[PDB]
Amino acid sequence: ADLEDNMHTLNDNLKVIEKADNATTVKDALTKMQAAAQDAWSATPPKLEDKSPDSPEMSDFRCGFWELIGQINAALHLAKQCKVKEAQAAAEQLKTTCNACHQKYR
Amino acid sequence: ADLEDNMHTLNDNLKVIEKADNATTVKDALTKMQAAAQDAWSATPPKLEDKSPDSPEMSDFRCGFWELIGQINAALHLAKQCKVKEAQAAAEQLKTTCNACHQKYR
Amino acid sequence: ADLEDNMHTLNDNLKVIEKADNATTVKDALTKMQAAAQDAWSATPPKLEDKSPDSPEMSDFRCGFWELIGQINAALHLAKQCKVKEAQAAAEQLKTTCNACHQKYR
Amino acid sequence: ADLEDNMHTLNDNLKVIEKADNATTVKDALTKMQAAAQDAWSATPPKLEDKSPDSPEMSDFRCGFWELIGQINAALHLAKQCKVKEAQAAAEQLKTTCNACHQKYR
Amino acid sequence: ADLEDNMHTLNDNLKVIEKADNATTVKDALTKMQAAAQDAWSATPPKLEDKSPDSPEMSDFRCGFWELIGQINAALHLAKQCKVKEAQAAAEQLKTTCNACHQKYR
Amino acid sequence: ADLEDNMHTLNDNLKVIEKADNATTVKDALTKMQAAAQDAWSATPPKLEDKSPDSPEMSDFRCGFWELIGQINAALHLAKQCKVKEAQAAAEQLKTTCNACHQKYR
Amino acid sequence: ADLEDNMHTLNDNLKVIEKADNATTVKDALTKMQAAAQDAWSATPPKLEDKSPDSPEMSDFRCGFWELIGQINAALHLAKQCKVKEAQAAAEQLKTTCNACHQKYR
Amino acid sequence: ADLEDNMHTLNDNLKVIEKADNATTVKDALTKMQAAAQDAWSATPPKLEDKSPDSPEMSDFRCGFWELIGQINAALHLAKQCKVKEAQAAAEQLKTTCNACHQKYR
Amino acid sequence: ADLEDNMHTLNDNLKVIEKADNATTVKDALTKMQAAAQDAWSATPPKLEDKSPDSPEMSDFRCGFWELIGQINAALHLAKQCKVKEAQAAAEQLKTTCNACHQKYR
Amino acid sequence: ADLEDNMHTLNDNLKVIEKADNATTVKDALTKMQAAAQDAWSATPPKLEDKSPDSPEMSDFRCGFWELIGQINAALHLAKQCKVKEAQAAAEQLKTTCNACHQKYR
Amino acid sequence: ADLEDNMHTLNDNLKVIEKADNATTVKDALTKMQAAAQDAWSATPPKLEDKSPDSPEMSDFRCGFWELIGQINAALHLAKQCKVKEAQAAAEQLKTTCNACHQKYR
Amino acid sequence: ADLEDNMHTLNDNLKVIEKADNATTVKDALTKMQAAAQDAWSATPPKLEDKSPDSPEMSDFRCGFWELIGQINAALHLAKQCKVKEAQAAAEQLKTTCNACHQKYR
Ligand code: HEC
Ligand code: HEC
Ligand code: HEC
Ligand code: HEC
Ligand code: HEC
Ligand code: HEC
Ligand code: HEC
Ligand code: HEC
Ligand code: HEC
Ligand code: HEC
Ligand code: HEC
Ligand code: HEC
Ligand SMILES: [Fe+3]
Ligand SMILES: [Fe+3]
Ligand SMILES: [Fe+3]
Ligand SMILES: [Fe+3]
Ligand SMILES: [Fe+3]
Ligand SMILES: [Fe+3]
Ligand SMILES: [Fe+3]
Ligand SMILES: [Fe+3]
Ligand SMILES: [Zn+2]
Ligand SMILES: [Zn+2]
Ligand SMILES: [Zn+2]
Ligand SMILES: [Zn+2]
Ligand SMILES: [Zn+2]
Ligand SMILES: [Zn+2]
Ligand SMILES: [Zn+2]
Ligand SMILES: [Zn+2]
Ligand SMILES: [Zn+2]
Ligand SMILES: [Zn+2]
Ligand SMILES: [Zn+2]
Ligand SMILES: [Zn+2]
Ligand SMILES: [Zn+2]
Ligand SMILES: [Zn+2]
Ligand SMILES: [Zn+2]
Ligand SMILES: [Zn+2]
Ligand SMILES: [Zn+2]
Ligand SMILES: [Zn+2]
């Protein structure tokens, strides 16, 4: 998937999680998010296409994705314990990480 | 597994490695440690529950876990070459990384 | 594989990619590079054997390998879309990351 | 996934297919559509919740989905032969089946 | 399995579902029902042996089995969301399809 | 395989079954027919290329293939019970389903 | 499955074996009995719910189930050699093991 | 794992089960106990190293482990039905089997 | 395999173990012995054919096989730790169990 | 499959290859040819039934099949590199090996 | 297995086939012979240890084993068609290939 | 991989084997050589591109590769028994086969 498609997967699955009422739907959505983020961390955002690959910006992009992966993993961990509301709250807190990256590079 | 259970897995398997006398027992123990550390790096320690997820502390927690993973992988690499004493010595050196994190966040 | 063998795998596969004329050969070569880099990031270079594992040098070594992994993943992503010339150009740009690390630690 | 989510998947993947430039993207998108249609054909749409399961309406609903599945399969058959433009044209033509069902039951 | 044995499987598993108190038991029973229905839909029942394979009676028979499969799938979808009572109600609802076919052909 | 290839596979395997003398050969042949029919039911025959995808012709074509699949499955069921002659007789009778569709659409 | 369900499975499959006419049906039925007995041997029958887990009754119950498993395995071995009538006769003789346990604990 | 390690595993997982608040944790812990007991039943405890392999003592040792395995399996059967509190009570009751063997052979 | 053939397998593999000079050969032989013992324990030997299946003789026969399986497992556990000489000594030790059963029933 | 049926498979798939317009169709046909050749090389053809199995004629027959297998592998290697026209030319070239054997033994 | 072990396996399984009364036993035995021959063809017999690896002797040895493999495969093909007596007769005839090689190199 | 790359693989792995100090490295290297030789035996070397596929030269080329495969398999058989020095000596001896073919066809 291309970077924009991975972002759309992330966005769609937050909506699924928010409206879900059981752990299976939540786990499935978080698993799709994990895969999208694992594909996206190695991408180059359009606004950074002219920057050195080892630039502070590109390193910060990767770091932010690795942090998002950690938070998705932790939300999935709650969902695998069947803690639906807690997993949903963790997914809501994810948005702060999405937004922080977007402010810099989207 | 919860964070404390992953730590207990790490602790138990260092003891197994120290007393082991063959590469199979060592490889098995290191594989369990690898899995425990892969589950733990995305956790939030109790003493950091009120901190921002992107805080210097939380980033340092993750970094320390990624370093521990690298050292476990390298010890496993020795054990897979059947170098039992060298793998045991690498596992002993792991303790410095465990202790360094504990001084800050346990 | 030992560190030097992983480097040889990386070097051999850049040569394969450069001369290739189809996506299958390129994808295969990049997959071998991905595996070599995943094995190598946890190694200790000979020139850093006496340094603390958490030293700035060792952390920089790991970081550089994680960056190389990201660039390999991205080249593979192009090749999986069958974009042979673009994947070859991405592999050529990899060399800057190889060389930057070598200047410091080889 | 619930019926609304499966419909969203179908729509998203039509857009991916239309903008695609390689067979890998197209095949993956059509495979996702196949999965969504296989999940959806046994669902009950809101407007038919009070009808007999063997009503003309529910039978017509199932028949339209089996039609859609066949057309997706045919498009995927083109994409597996790497015929990107032909598979894109088949995907565009699917829309008549989407619209026919929506006119009756959405 | 022969037709009568597949029917006995369907009947046994509806009773298991009704008595169940958790989603695992329900899911396991519905999966057995799926398999029995997949194996039965292509059979010729005793009272239709002297009809043409393309006869309206045989076509009606196959159609009824396909509607049964859809309803079993829909009940399984609820059970996979851990909705035990809803899946149990869906399982009672599919008795309508059992009954309709039996009325004509058992 | 295109529709013509799938029809050739069906015809080849009827001949294999007729001349066979053991259940293994018959089961394999019937399994190949099942796969060919599964790939063919979603095709559009040449003489229906100008009909709507939901035309009465196309829906009759699909219905005939589902009939054929059922009769193949039923023959395979006899072969799986090692009833060679009965499975051969069921395969021979398949010809009336082949012929009926051919009269209309071949 | 609970103990009653496992006993129902055992009884259903004895009847399938008795009426069967080929090795495939017999092998499948015996495989289902093996699974039911494997799930049942660890159960506590109602009439022993008040006995110590290590009581002479409970140990006699487990011993009878291991006997039954052995005799099922031996019947399955005959069926796997395609010896239908011999496997049917072995299944019939199983009844003396069923009955002996029932006299004491059912 | 050696006998001492398998005993440690059994003890650790009893504690995990007692403190657990969801079926996933309980099922995983019971699965680990099943594996440890399957490894241990064929071991020779230090105090019996000079006894015949068919001695009353070694036979009693094996019998006690087969008992334990049955009780673990029964507890896991409850946990697979998501019956957390009931599975916890079954795990607590296992301790009588642990203690009975320890009194004789530890 | 029949009982005599499983016995021949056990005998051949003890000799392979004694002559072996490495753990791979020993492990492979012990795994073959496990399979032969698993297949034999449910048989009725010629000298016991006219005994009841629950007779003391048949119970003794099954018990001896279970003790054999435990001893093969214990030897395999040593071989998996690469302890060739210890596994070879364990393999000689299990001749006691072979002999005891043969004394009574061969 | 019997020898004649494996020959028919080889012949059908050469024609599929010639008519193909993409590498997937070619790869699939060559894989079927590999399997048919692997199954045929050990057969005795009618015109050689009264020759010794080590006769020059039978040795020549096996040799020709091994050369065929190599040429099918080499054509498959081209097709895996997506070189459709080159793989098609390699497929025409292997008719020399078909012809040579047929000259002597068909 | 060393060459002597592989030859013992070949001889054991000829005897199993000769005394067998069903296709399952024959197929298994022939499958074990196939594996033994596959492991043996690359060996160097004692009486050729002093010959060049490419000597006429060693190449004749390899050729005889490829002959044997072909005849084993052909016997297995008959067994897979459930032709027990024909497969037994093919196995008996294998002895002329065994004997021819033994006369030269055993 | 093309023929030149497979030759490079063979040469690289001889060097890995010669410098190795453990069986894991040796086994992996020999496995890679086996794969390279299996790919290469069906290739056509540049100097033989104008020869008949059944020419003495091409037949000799295939025969030399089958020899090489046998010798690699024999070396791997030693390495699987953990006989590092013996496997290294077998790998060194392979070189005579490499050189014999190169003298004729490189
Ligand atoms: C950096 C580390 C990011 C994180 C974490 C997330 N996103 Fe993102 N996002 C990022 C970039 C650089 C871009 C621009 C991509 C481009 O090709 O222009 C985006 C874009 C989006 C979009 C818009 C996609 C589109 O159709 O153009 C969405 C909807 C989006 N991102 C959502 C999203 C969510 C929900 C995230 C957290 C769960 C998230 N992103 C993380 C960079 C980064
Ligand atoms: C940070 C990067 C850490 C690394 C590396 C290791 N540990 Fe740890 N450990 C860490 C925290 C934050 C905590 C507190 C957890 C809590 O829930 O309070 C711990 C705790 C432990 C414990 C005690 C567990 C308990 O029962 O309370 C142990 C025994 C332990 N840790 C062991 C351990 C070992 C052996 C490690 C290296 C191999 C190791 N830890 C690494 C943080 C971090
Ligand atoms: C650090 C982050 C590195 C990256 C990225 C790459 N290489 Fe490397 N390389 C590194 C070290 C520390 C060493 C020394 C290893 C030793 O044991 O001495 C090397 C060595 C090489 C070699 C020489 C190997 C030898 O036979 O001695 C080669 C050919 C090589 N490296 C190639 C290579 C390529 C092609 C890379 C990018 C694709 C690359 N390396 C990355 C450190 C690092
Ligand atoms: C009947 C056989 C249908 C076919 C074929 C397709 N769709 Fe559909 N769609 C159908 C219904 C009954 C509904 C309403 C569901 C509800 O809960 O109200 C829908 C809805 C949609 C939507 C809206 C989803 C949402 O966000 O609420 C979309 C975007 C949609 N459908 C798309 C779609 C496409 C692209 C299809 C063909 C490829 C398609 N649908 C087929 C019934 C049927
Ligand atoms: C037609 C499409 C049917 C559907 C749907 C179901 N059943 Fe059925 N059933 C059908 C026939 C033609 C027959 C007669 C079979 C015969 O060989 O005589 C049956 C029979 C049964 C039986 C009796 C079987 C026996 O033990 O002899 C049972 C218990 C039964 N059917 C149950 C059943 C259930 C529970 C169904 C829905 C879940 C169901 N059937 C569907 C035809 C059809
Ligand atoms: C409709 C539901 C069909 C069924 C059932 C069967 N066949 Fe068919 N067949 C069908 C069509 C529309 C066509 C024309 C295909 C075309 O591209 O023109 C065919 C054709 C054949 C052929 C000729 C193939 C060729 O290369 O020209 C054969 C040999 C054939 N069909 C055989 C066949 C058999 C044996 C069937 C039953 C087992 C069978 N067909 C079923 C439509 C349908
Ligand atoms: C002890 C070792 C048993 C063996 C061997 C078999 N059965 Fe059994 N059976 C056993 C008990 C303790 C019970 C009572 C279960 C309860 O919950 O009360 C049963 C019961 C049955 C039943 C009745 C099931 C019901 O729904 O009431 C049947 C039909 C039955 N058992 C059949 C059966 C067969 C066919 C067996 C041999 C093949 C067999 N059982 C063995 C204990 C034991
Ligand atoms: C016999 C059938 C046993 C059963 C059932 C259980 N245990 Fe055990 N245990 C047994 C022996 C012979 C020994 C001594 C082993 C030795 O090497 O000395 C033990 C020991 C333990 C220990 C101590 C382990 C250690 O750290 O040295 C523990 C913690 C223990 N056993 C726990 C345990 C539990 C929780 C059990 C039931 C779930 C259990 N054991 C069963 C023999 C037997
Ligand atoms: C009872 C529990 C036994 C155990 C344990 C072992 N054997 Fe056995 N063996 C047993 C019987 C009843 C028989 C007679 C079988 C018959 O059909 O007559 C045998 C026979 C053998 C043989 C001879 C087989 C033959 O070629 O005819 C051998 C070589 C043999 N047994 C070896 C053997 C070994 C090595 C064992 C332990 C590893 C072993 N047996 C265990 C009963 C039992
Ligand atoms: C010897 C090594 C052969 C090679 C290589 C190929 N074929 Fe063959 N073929 C061979 C024989 C001995 C026979 C006669 C078989 C018999 O039972 O009479 C055949 C036959 C055929 C046939 C006719 C089969 C039929 O329908 O009766 C065909 C169509 C055929 N062969 C095709 C074929 C192709 C295309 C080959 C290369 C790709 C090929 N054969 C190789 C012997 C040998
Ligand atoms: C050459 C191509 C052979 C074929 C074909 C078969 N065998 Fe063989 N066998 C061969 C050699 C070189 C040797 C000597 C091995 C040694 O280490 O000295 C053997 C030996 C045997 C033996 C004796 C084994 C022992 O322990 O001494 C047996 C029982 C034997 N061979 C049986 C056998 C059978 C049954 C074959 C055909 C099915 C067969 N061999 C083929 C070389 C070759
Ligand atoms: C024939 C049966 C061969 C055997 C056995 C081996 N090699 Fe080879 N090799 C062969 C040819 C025809 C060629 C030339 C290919 C070409 O495209 O020109 C080669 C070439 C090599 C090379 C050079 C590769 C390069 O970088 O261009 C090497 C390094 C090589 N061969 C090594 C090698 C080794 C180590 C072998 C045995 C283990 C070996 N070859 C066997 C033909 C044959
Ligand atoms: Fe960092
Ligand atoms: Fe219809
Ligand atoms: Fe669950
Ligand atoms: Fe069979
Ligand atoms: Fe007992
Ligand atoms: Fe090993
Ligand atoms: Fe030859
Ligand atoms: Fe492709
Ligand atoms: Zn992607
Ligand atoms: Zn979307
Ligand atoms: Zn966890
Ligand atoms: Zn512990
Ligand atoms: Zn490595
Ligand atoms: Zn190289
Ligand atoms: Zn769904
Ligand atoms: Zn069936
Ligand atoms: Zn029943
Ligand atoms: Zn197709
Ligand atoms: Zn159960
Ligand atoms: Zn163990
Ligand atoms: Zn057996
Ligand atoms: Zn033997
Ligand atoms: Zn065949
Ligand atoms: Zn054909
Ligand atoms: Zn071997
Ligand atoms: Zn290749």
Domain ranges across chain I: 1-106
From CA B92, how far away is CA B94, in angstroms rounded?
5
Alpha carbons within 13 A on the beta-carbon side of J54 = 17
Does D77 show up as a binding residue in the annotation? no
Amino acid letter, L99: N
Ligand 8 contact via H19 beta carbon (within 6 Å): no
Q: Which ligand has the shortest distance to the CA of B24?
A: 18
Could you give the C-alpha distances from G9 to E5, E29, G6, in angstroms and in order? 12, 13, 5
From CA D42, how far away is CA D38, in angstroms rounded?
8
From CA J84, how far away is CA J89, in angstroms rounded?
9
Could you give the C-alpha distances from F1 to B9, D32, J88, J91, in angstroms and in order? 53, 22, 17, 18
**I2, containing H or E segment:** none
Q: Collect all residues from A whose CB is shorter than 8 A from any CB in H.
A: 80-83
DSSP state of K12: H
**What atom of ligand 1 comes closest to residue A63's alpha carbon?**
2
Tell how many helices (H) and how many strands (E) occur in chain J.
Answer: 5, 0
> How many Cβ atoms are within 10 Å of J44's Cβ, its own excluded?
17
Instruction: Quickly list H helices, chain L.
Output: 3-19, 23-40, 56-80, 84-105
Could you give the C-alpha distances from I51 to G78, G86, G99, I47, I105, in angstroms and in order? 20, 18, 18, 9, 12
From CA H16, how far away is CA H24, in angstroms rounded?
11
CB contact under 8 A, K82 and F23: yes
Please choose, from the candidates A91, A32, A104, the residue with its C-alpha nearest in 3D space to the C-alpha of residue A61. A104
Ligand 14 center to residue F59 CA distance, Å? 8
From CA H71, how far away is CA E26, in angstroms rounded?
24
CB I75 within 8 A of CB I90: yes
Chain J residue closest in CA terms to L60: J67
> Tokens 């020899």 — which residue?
L67
Enumerate the residues of chain J whose CB falls inside 8 A of the CB of residue C21: 81
Please choose, from the candidates D102, D95, D73, the residue with its C-alpha nearest in 3D space to the C-alpha of residue D3. D102
From CA I35, how far away is CA I68, in angstroms rounded?
12
Q: What token pair was written down for I5? A: 């053939």
Which residue numbers of I belong to the known binding site for heme b?
A: 7, 102
CB contact under 8 A, D54 and E100: yes
CB E43 within 8 A of CB F74: yes
CB K61 within 8 A of CB L92: no
User: CA gyration radius for chain E?
Assistant: 14
From CA L30, how far away is CA L16, in angstroms rounded?
9
Interface test with chain L among C5, C15, C16, C22, by most L beta carbons within 10 Å: C5
Enumerate the residues of chain B whose CB falls inside 8 A of the CB of residue H5: 16
- Residue nearest ligand 9's atom 1 by CA: I101
Q: What token pair was written down for J18? A: 């010639």
From CA E34, how far away is CA E14, in angstroms rounded?
12
DSSP state of C81: T
Measure CA A6 to chain center. Answer: 9
Ligand 19 center to residue L68 CA distance, Å? 14
CB D80 within 8 A of CB J24: yes
Could you give the C-alpha distances from I103 to B3, I95, I98, J42, in angstroms and in order? 57, 12, 9, 48
Burial H72-83 (b: 16+ CB within 10 A, else e): bbbbbbbbbbbb
**What atom of ligand 1 comes closest to residue A10's alpha carbon?**
35
From CA L97, how far away is CA K54, in angstroms rounded?
8
For C73, the closest of A42, A53, A59 (CB atoms) is: A42
Measure CA I26 to chain center. Answer: 14
Angle between helices A56-80 and C56-80 (to 10 degrees): 80
Tell whether the torsion through CA atoms of F49, F52, F53 and F55 is positive or negative. negative
Q: Residue D9 contacts by C-beta under 8 Å, 6 or more apart in sequence?
A: D1, D32, D33, D35, D36
> Tokens 């003891």 — which residue?
B15
Ligand 29 center to residue G4 CA distance, Å? 11
Tell me how many degrees the CA angle C12-C15-C21 measures, rounded to the nearest 5.
Answer: 130
Angle between helices E3-19 and G3-19 (to 10 degrees): 170
Tell whether the torsion through CA atoms of F61, F62, F63 and F69 is positive or negative. positive
Alpha carbons within 13 A on the beta-carbon side of D53 = 25
From CA H78, how far away is CA H74, in angstroms rounded?
7
Please choose, from the candidates C47, C91, A10, L67, the residue with its C-alpha nearest in 3D space to the C-alpha of residue K66. L67
From CA G67, how far away is CA G104, in angstroms rounded?
15
Q: Collect all residues from F whose CB is shorter than 8 A from any CB in K.
A: 21-25
Q: Residue H20 contacts by C-beta under 8 Å, 6 or more apart in sequence?
A: H26, H29, H84, H88
Alpha carbons within 13 A on the beta-carbon side of B12 = 24
Could you give the C-alpha distances from I17 to D23, E93, I21, K31, L81, in angstroms and in order? 55, 62, 8, 23, 13
Q: Residue L65 contacts by C-beta under 8 Å, 6 or more apart in sequence?
A: L37, L40, L41, L101
Q: What token pair was written down for J57? A: 């004629």
Burial H13-47 (b: 16+ CB within 10 A, else e): bbebbeebeebbbbbbbbebbbebbebbbbbbbee
- Residue nearest ligand 7's atom 26 by CA: G4
Could you give the C-alpha distances from A81 to A15, A20, A76, B21, L25, in angstroms and in order? 21, 16, 9, 37, 41
Q: What token pair was written down for D64? A: 């339209």
From CA A40, how far away is CA A34, in angstroms rounded?
10
3-state secondary structure chain A: CCHHHHHHHHHHHHHHHHHCCCHHHHHHHHHHHHHHHHHHCCCCCHHHCCCCCCCHHHHHHHHHHHHHHHHHHHHHHHHHCCCHHHHHHHHHHHHHHHHHHHHHHC
**What atom of ligand 7 comes closest to residue G11's alpha carbon?**
35
Ligand 9 contact via I36 beta carbon (within 6 Å): no
Could you give the C-alpha distances from L4 to C19, K67, L40, in angstroms and in order? 12, 32, 9
- Quick one: residue F82, left, alpha or beta (phi over 0 = left, psi -120 to 50 = alpha)? left
Chain F residue closest in CA terms to D94: F53
CB contact under 8 A, J21 and D81: yes
CB K45 within 8 A of CB K61: yes
From CA H36, how far away is CA H34, in angstroms rounded?
6
From CA E56, how far away is CA E63, in angstroms rounded?
10
The yes-or-no reply on G/H contact (3 CB pairs or more, < 8 Å) is yes
Q: Which of D41, D62, D88, D98 to mutate to test the pocket of ligand 4 (most atoms within 8 A of CB)?
A: D98
CB J13 within 8 A of CB J32: yes
**What atom of ligand 4 comes closest to residue D101's alpha carbon?**
1
Q: Residue E85 contacts by C-beta under 8 Å, 6 or more apart in sequence?
A: none
From CA F16, how far away is CA F23, in angstroms rounded?
12
User: CA gyration radius for chain H?
Assistant: 14
Angle between helices L56-80 and L84-105 (to 10 degrees): 170
CB D94 within 8 A of CB D72: yes
Q: What token pair was written down for I54? A: 């629950």
Residue I4, SS3? Answer: helix
Technique of determination: X-ray
From CA F53, how far away is CA K4, in angstroms rounded?
67
**Furthest C-alpha separation in chain B:** 45
> How many Cβ atoms are within 10 Å of K63's Cβ, its own excluded?
17
From CA E30, how far away is CA E78, in angstroms rounded?
11
Measure CA E48 to chain center. Answer: 19
Please choose, from the candidates E38, E9, D74, the residue with its C-alpha nearest in 3D space to the C-alpha of residue F34. E38
Enumerate the residues of chain J whose CB falls inside 8 A of the CB of residue L54: 67, 96-97, 100
Q: Resolution limit in angstroms? A: 1.4
From CA K29, how far away is CA K11, in angstroms rounded?
10
Give the chains touching K; criterion: ≥3 Cβ pairs < 8 Å: F, G, I, J, L
CB D44 within 8 A of CB E86: no
From CA K27, how far away is CA K78, in angstroms rounded?
9
Ligand 11 contact via K98 beta carbon (within 6 Å): yes
Q: To the nearest whole angstrom, how far is the Cα of I51 from the nearest Cα of chain G?
A: 13
For L5, the closest of C1, C5, C16 (CB atoms) is: C16
From CA L34, how far away is CA L28, in angstroms rounded?
10
